[PDB]
Design a binder for this molecule. Structure first.
Ligand code: GTP
Ligand code: CL
Ligand code: MG
Ligand code: NA
Lengths: 128, 210, 18, 996
């Protein structure tokens, strides 16, 4: 005999799409980028609750972390055929729970429409 | 955290110092040039495999008339970034001057030289012209605060030198499970107001790939 | 013939397994 | 709170209030820190604050508050010093000198407050710049003497001398006048003998390393300017190359001194100096081998471990070796006793070249270029370096970079081409065996196969054709074999791409072997159907790449083929491009356009052109007929996409065919301009109905894309057009009618800047033939665009840039259009040019100044006529003063050269008496007076009001110099730079302007 010398483990990935997220600044009336990276829909294996988790490329810092609530409604944006905008009542990307008016843009209109389908799929799962 | 390092960020006015820092703080891209007056300090945390590392970023003024305390800002700095603009020959010509004033106060610190705005097609300061870093032992990166080309590299390099581990990597910060907040009608009035205004303000840069 | 035999092999280059 | 009390100067300054405000800044945070920041700023920028600095140096215990006090002193010394009474000057000198001596004698303070000592020393050097040696001849003797007493004062005197050398020789060019620089340089030069004795003495006899390091830091700076004799005719080379290379505290700095010694100005015909230059190199390499690491050490591993200052040291070593060897390697190549030294030093560079560090690699790569170039051309030199070059082949190949990193790749290719020529057999062998280690799987990875492919492709055209044939065949066979072996779509895609990459890099081989070329191209067509990421782009990029180089083999009829292969491509074009995205299709069509331009029979080229354009011409015709019968169809976004893509396919083919595109342009031209109008209507309609926000909507952007691609197609054709008569008679009038009025009559946010761009090209190519057309262009875009861009520097950036390009080309090619403007609009033209000067944006600034310069030249060329006389009466002094304003305001430094040239031209016009009328209104000055005399008075008056701190003597001297020197541009520029220094201070010497 010779002797020898992130908090996502519990979740299933339903949808994985590449996107850019914006937050609306009400005060100075304009849109501001919050991050660009993989947007992910994560179903918890314990609670069967689906969330959006989005991380920025390279630094991997969280720019979105909230439940896909059944109350939310994806509305279009006047300047885009590949974006949805919606009110979120509690996001914890920055740490402290806070409300936002988000927008989320994609590579194509087909990606955006698929996102909307998956977003509504996930909403139905969260009704239980 | 309490593992914290002071970083001075210097270079000519309009090179993109403040834009670069804001990108790292909030993720936004500021299109407007609003000149920094003297200095703004911004705490900036990265999550690494050797625990979190905080930079106290002293974003200084590049315009002569808004210089403020000038080299006063460099005292007890433990690292720095010198910034220029590859679309502007004069911002690279002034790099030796920013370095001179920086090292006279900070004799032995890691320093990164950054050529910003490499997204712009008509590049004026060519790659082969950029050699000032060699005899002064500065790390050099082409960067773009707009496209995020190499935007993490200056902070990753300084992190490695300050902690004294060349295998240090940025890693994914812990994603806590988000809350289950029920909305009340007392805050739905302002959410509905903000939402109607948000939909009718066009998102910026719609020709971009994302 | 060496160029011709290479050309023939080139013709059957693919990305698919089966 | 109570922090703002220190802004009250009616009271005595509370030092404890200062130190807490200073502490709140350097150790506090948030709202607290930000508030202290604005108070220290307002305290410092108070012009009285320097008087309260001697107080702080004595009474305060915070080094930061003292630092800030010296910064306030520094500002007074550089800017207001000569305005003080003589006693305040001496008083300040004394308590700066006294503070330095007292800080050096206190060992506690000398160790722990290094920032505050170095700042005091810098503040001393600023006094010397004002006061030495003319009012302080004993500074250098008194400095040398005081260095005997205390070893700490000796060390600090070396820091003072270092900084003095830096300020006089390294940073004086921008910051002081030419005359003051020369005075200070001569002064340092006069007393350097005495400075060098002290320096050499300390290096010989000293044992304190902190003293030795500081002395070597000063030596590094002296080496920039001192004569070579101080290095060669003393013992100092031995000391540097042996004694100081052994100890690690001194090593770092000594190595940098020897790097600069290697660059000293040296006589090249003295044998004793050649031996001394050999010796210090021999000694330096010897210390490295015995005290740091041997030749065999793995420097890649050491550098990556990053212990202490190893990375900086290895950087400095590379800089030393490359610098010395570039200049001196010839000295080591003849003597056989120096052969081991030569190859050892190069073997260290080989090991340094393996370090994973991009910028270091560039530095070593510049040296390898210099060497292998010399081995390619210089006789009997390559045999010496055969073992060095063989190792270098492997280093370059293993670190080869993609063609996308353009500068690095170009440098690597050049070096590798030279090394391939030097020994083709060795290069071939290394590449074949590297390929074998991908096949056996011991070095296999996506990155590793990619890098090898980029290297194998880089040496195309260096081998003989026969050797190349054998080599390519072997590489392709092996790579084809590699693909068959590998399992999975990811792996096979990576190898197929590399196969395709190498093939595209070897066009000579493709040209000689038609059967193979055909098979490759047919394979690329199969790959245009693959959905796997990146494959379709690869296939399209490779296709156009091959075509650019082998086009002639697509256009002729090859033996054993029924027709030229271009015909065969055009037949299956629908089936071939069916699965491509739109811009992939456009590249495909562009590639076909390259081929078709090779056919020199007009009838056949034109036939191929219409055959190629069959699909987009059929889709076009069914949309013209549809959408002209009912404009309703253009709101259908799907129809808008189809139309844009037709125009884009036309742009892409026009881009490769140029003048040959004309017949195809003719098929669509009139209907396309009608479409431009129908689309224009849609856009104005949606803006009225929905608001300015409509310009952001997908439907309006889609329509604007149609307009822009149409403008882009026309610009592209016209830019490359050979038959200008057809351009004028057929294309131009319909274009101006279609676009100009629509531009003028749209709201600002709906005006396409592409209109201006397109017109710039039209005026460039045929402006000389359409004078009434240029007039119509000005009228339609000039005033309405100027008003978009004359409220700030930020808004409408594209329009702003294209606007000044348009005026530039009009001013060159059709200046008569500016003559026909009514005086009110000509005044706006002048306003618009001066407005361009004030931009920071380089594209606008450079054209502003160039237009001004060309306008002045255009008026000179008119001679002695009423328009030239009236232009000078109205606008000469406007141009002189607006040019002066941007020269002197410190926010347009990027435009100095052009400003100086414009200013020189304006001044020269008066000096040569080329302005015939007087520049003054009658009876403002005496009646006989020359423009010369009145130019001097206007300028003297202008500068006295603009810079009231200048004396009349200063202003008059500057102007005599400037006007006398208006023939020699480089001297003129010097005089301007002297003025820019003197306006930053009070009491500048007027004699300074006699320098030249
Ligand atoms: N194209 C491009 N523009 C950039 C980039 N980074 C910054 N900018 C622009 O440059 C301008 C100046 O940016 P700032 O960060 O305000 O300049 P600064 O260096 O802080 O200047 P001072 O505060 O005066 O020293 C802004 O208009 C930015 O939009 C970049 O990476 N690419
Ligand atoms: Cl001494
Ligand atoms: Mg700023
Ligand atoms: Na290549």
């Amino acid at each position: 005999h010779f002797e020898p010398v992130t908090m996502e483990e519990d979740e299933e990935v339903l949808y994985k799409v590449r996107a850019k997220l914006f937050r609306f600044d009400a005060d100075a009336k304009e849109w501001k980028e919050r991050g660009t990276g993989d947007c992910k829909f994560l179903k918890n294996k314990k609670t069967n609750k689906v969330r959006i988790l989005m991380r920025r490329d390279k630094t991997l810092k969280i720019c979105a972390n909230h439940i896909i609530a059944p109350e939310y409604t994806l509305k279009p944006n006047v300047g885009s055929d590949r974006s949805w905008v919606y009110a979120c009542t509690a996001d914890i990307a920055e740490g402290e729970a806070e409300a936002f008016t988000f927008a989320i843009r994609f590579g194509s209109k087909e990606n955006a429409d698929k996102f909307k389908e998956e977003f509504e799929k996930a909403q139905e799962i969260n009704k239980k | 955290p309490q593992v914290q390092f002071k970083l001075v960020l210097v270079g000519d006015g309009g090179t993109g110092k403040t834009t670069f820092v804001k990108r790292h703080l909030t993720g936004e891209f500021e299109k407007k040039y609003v000149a920094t007056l003297g200095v703004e300090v911004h705490p900036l945390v990265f999550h690494t495999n050797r625990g979190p590392i905080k930079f106290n970023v002293w974003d200084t003024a590049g315009q002569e008339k808004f210089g403020g305390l000038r080299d006063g800002y460099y005292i007890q700095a433990q690292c720095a970034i010198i910034m220029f603009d590859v679309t502007s020959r004069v911002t690279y010509k002034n790099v030796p001057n920013w370095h001179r004033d920086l090292v006279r106060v900070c004799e032995n610190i890691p320093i990164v030289l950054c050529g910003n705005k490499v997204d712009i097609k008509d590049r004026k300061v060519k790659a082969k012209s950029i050699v000032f870093h060699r005899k002064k032992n500065l790390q050099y990166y082409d960067i773009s605060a707009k496209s995020n080309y190499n935007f993490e590299k200056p902070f990753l390099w300084l992190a490695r030198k300050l902690i004294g581990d060349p295998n240090l990597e940025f890693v994914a910060m812990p994603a806590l499970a988000p809350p289950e907040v029920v909305m009340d009608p007392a805050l739905a009035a302002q959410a509905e107001h903000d939402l109607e205004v948000a939909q009718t303000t066009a998102l910026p840069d719609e020709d971009d790939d994302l | 013939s060496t160029v011709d035999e290479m050309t023939k092999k080139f013709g059957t280059l693919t990305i698919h397994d089966d | 709170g109570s922090m703002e009390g220190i802004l009250d100067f009616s009271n005595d300054l509370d030092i404890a209030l200062l130190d807490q405000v200073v502490s709140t800044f350097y150790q506090g945070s948030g709202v607290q820190q930000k508030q202290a920041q604005e108070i220290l700023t307002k305290f410092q920028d108070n012009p009285d604050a320097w008087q309260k600095a001697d107080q702080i140096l004595q009474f305060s215990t915070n080094p930061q508050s003292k630092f800030i006090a010296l910064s306030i002193l520094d500002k007074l010394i550089t800017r207001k010093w000569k305005l003080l009474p003589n006693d305040h000057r001496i008083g300040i000198r004394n308590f700066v000198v006294g503070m330095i001596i007292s800080m050096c004698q206190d060992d506690e303070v000398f160790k722990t407050q290094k920032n505050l000592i170095n700042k005091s020393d810098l503040t001393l050097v600023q006094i010397l710049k004002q006061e030495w040696p003319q009012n302080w001849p004993e500074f250098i003797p008194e400095l040398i003497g005081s260095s005997s007493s205390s070893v700490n004062v000796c060390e600090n005197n070396m820091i003072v001398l270092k900084l003095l050398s830096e300020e006089v020789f390294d940073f004086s060019a921008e910051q002081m006048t030419q005359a003051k620089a020369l005075h200070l340089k001569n002064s340092m030069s006069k007393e350097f003998e005495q400075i060098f004795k002290l320096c050499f003495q300390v290096l010989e006899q000293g044992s304190s390393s902190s003293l030795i390091v500081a002395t070597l830091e000063s030596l590094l700076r002296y080496l920039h300017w001192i004569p070579y004799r101080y290095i060669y005719e003393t013992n100092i080379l031995e000391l540097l190359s042996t004694k100081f290379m052994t100890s690690p505290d001194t090593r770092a700095i000594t190595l940098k001194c020897l790097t600069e010694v290697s660059n000293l100005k040296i006589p090249q015909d003295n044998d004793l100096i050649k031996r001394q230059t050999v010796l210090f190199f021999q000694n330096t390499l010897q210390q490295i081998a015995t005290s740091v690491m041997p030749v065999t050490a793995d420097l890649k591993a050491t550098y990556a471990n990053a212990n202490g200052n190893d990375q900086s040291f290895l950087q400095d070593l590379a800089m030393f070796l490359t610098t010395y060897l570039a200049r001196n390697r010839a000295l080591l190549e003849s003597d056989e006793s120096l052969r081991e030294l030569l190859l050892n030093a190069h073997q260290y560079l080989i090991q340094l070249s393996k370090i994973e560090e991009r910028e270091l690699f560039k530095t070593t790569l510049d040296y390898w270029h210099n060497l292998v170039a010399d081995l390619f051309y210089e006789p009997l030199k390559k045999h010496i370096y055969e073992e060095i070059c063989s190792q270098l082949r492997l280093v370059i190949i293993e670190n080869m970079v993609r063609p996308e990193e353009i500068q690095l790749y170009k440098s690597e290719r050049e070096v590798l081409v030279y090394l391939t020529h030097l020994n083709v057999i060795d290069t071939e062998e290394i590449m074949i065996s590297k390929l074998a280690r991908q096949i056996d799987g011991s070095e296999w990875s996506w990155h590793n196969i990619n890098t090898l492919s980029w290297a194998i492709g880089s040496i195309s055209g260096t081998m003989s054709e026969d050797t190349e044939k054998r080599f390519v065949v072997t590489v392709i066979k092996d790579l084809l074999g590699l693909c068959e072996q590998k399992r999975g779509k990811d792996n096979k895609a990576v190898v197929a791409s590399d196969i395709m990459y190498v093939v595209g890099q070897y066009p000579r081989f493709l040209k000689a072997h038609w059967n193979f070329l055909r098979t490759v191209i047919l394979k690329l067509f199969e790959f245009m159907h693959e959905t796997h990421e990146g494959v379709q782009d690869m296939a399209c990029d490779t296709f156009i790449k091959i075509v650019q180089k082998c086009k002639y083999h697509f256009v002729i009829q090859q033996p054993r083929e029924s027709e030229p292969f271009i015909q065969t491509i055009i037949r299956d074009i629908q089936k071939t491009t069916a699965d491509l995205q739109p811009q992939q299709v456009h590249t495909f069509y562009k590639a076909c356009g390259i081929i078709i331009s090779e056919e020199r029979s007009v009838a056949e080229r034109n036939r191929l052109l219409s055959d190629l354009m069959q699909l987009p011409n059929m889709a076009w015709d069914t949309i013209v007929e549809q959408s002209t019968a009912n404009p309703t169809l253009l709101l259908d976004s799907e129809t808008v996409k189809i139309i844009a893509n037709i125009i884009k396919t036309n742009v892409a083919v026009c881009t490769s065919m140029g003048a040959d595109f004309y017949p195809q342009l003719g098929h669509i031209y009139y209907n396309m301009l009608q479409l431009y109008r129908a689309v224009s209507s849609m856009i104005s309609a949606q803006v009225a109905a929905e608001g300015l926000i409509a310009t952001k909507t997908p439907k309006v952007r889609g329509l604007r894309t149609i307009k822009k691609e149409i403008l882009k197609l026309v610009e592209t054709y016209i830019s490359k057009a050979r038959n200008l008569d057809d351009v004028v008679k057929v294309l131009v009038e319909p274009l101006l009618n279609a676009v100009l009025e629509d531009y003028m009559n749209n709201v600002p946010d709906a005006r396409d800047a592409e209109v201006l761009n397109c017109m710039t090209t039209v005026v460039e190519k045929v402006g000389h033939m359409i004078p009434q057309g240029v007039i119509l262009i000005l009228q339609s875009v000039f005033e309405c665009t100027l008003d978009m861009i004359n409220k700030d520097f930020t808004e409408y950036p594209e329009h702003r840039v294209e606007f000044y390009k348009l005026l530039k080309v009009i001013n060159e090619k059709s200046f008569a259009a500016f003559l026909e403007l009514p005086p009110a609009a000509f005044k706006l033209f002048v306003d618009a040019i001066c407005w361009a000067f004030k931009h920071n944006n380089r594209d606008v600034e450079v054209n502003g100044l160039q237009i001004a310069l060309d306008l002045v030249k255009n008026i000179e060329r008119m001679g002695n006529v009423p328009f030239a006389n009236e232009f000078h009466k109205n606008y000469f002094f406007i141009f002189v003063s607006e040019t002066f304003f941007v020269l002197t305001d410190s926010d347009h430094k990027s435009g100095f050269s052009k400003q100086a040239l414009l200013l020189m031209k304006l001044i020269s016009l008066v000096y040569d008496n080329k302005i015939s009328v007087p520049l003054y209104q009658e009876a403002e000055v005496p009646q006989g007076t020359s423009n010369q005399v009145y130019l001097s008075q206007y300028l003297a008056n202008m500068l006295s009001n603009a810079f009231p701190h200048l004396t009349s003597e200063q202003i008059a001297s500057f102007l005599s110099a400037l006007t006398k020197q208006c023939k020699d541009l480089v001297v003129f520029k010097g005089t301007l730079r002297d003025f820019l220094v003197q306006i930053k201070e009070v009491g500048g010497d007027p004699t300074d302007y006699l320098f030249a």
